[PDB]
């Protein structure tokens, strides 16, 4: 049972409702298969709407800091506040893009290279989208965002590329809206 000061907490820290956490801990609660206060990766997959996207594995994997197998109710919910609509918070448009760079850059060195925006792409686009259009759309953001000719791109190069864009009307960003909504409901 969630203390509460515990929820105080929890409020302060992320932005969400007494009632929206008492949801979370709840879903939290039903997820935890081996009742000891933590879950693991493979807890995650009776979120069927997460585990099933085609990032699912990487938003999963990334709800655990290094080292880590285990994550607790409070690494959860820090979590799932950066996935808040926004309405500095972690559901800041920095933090928001920050956790979405970090679903690119899978060796964690702070810049994309382009292998790993291959990798991305090739998860998120349709059936007909042909390897030499994938290599020139990797190419083309690229290009777009770097602006120290590196050709990767760091993580400011990602925000600034987006510096005039609605980050919150990005379908990628609105999924994860409704995720945490669909968490707590
Ligand atoms: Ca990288
Ligand atoms: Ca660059």
Do not use: C, W
């Amino acid at each position: 049972l969630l203390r509460d000061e515990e929820l105080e907490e929890i409020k302060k820290e992320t932005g969400f409702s007494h009632s929206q956490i008492t949801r979370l801990y709840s879903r939290f609660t039903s997820l935890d298969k081996g009742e000891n206060g933590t879950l693991s990766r493979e807890d995650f997959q009776r979120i069927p709407e997460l585990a099933i996207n085609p990032l699912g594995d990487r938003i999963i994997n990334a709800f655990f800091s290094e080292g880590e197998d285990q994550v607790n109710f409070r690494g959860f919910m820090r979590t799932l506040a950066h996935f808040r609509p926004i309405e500095e918070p972690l559901n800041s448009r920095s933090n928001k893009l920050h956790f979405a760079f970090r679903l690119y850059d899978l060796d964690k060195d702070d810049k994309i290279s382009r292998d790993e925006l291959l990798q991305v792409l090739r998860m998120m686009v349709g059936v007909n989208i042909s390897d030499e259009q994938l290599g020139s759309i990797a190419d083309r953001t690229i290009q777009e965002a770097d602006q120290d000719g590196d050709s990767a791109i760091s993580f400011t190069e990602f925000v600034k590329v987006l510096e005039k864009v609605d980050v919150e009307q990005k379908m990628s960003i609105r999924f994860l809206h409704k995720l945490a909504a669909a968490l707590e409901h």
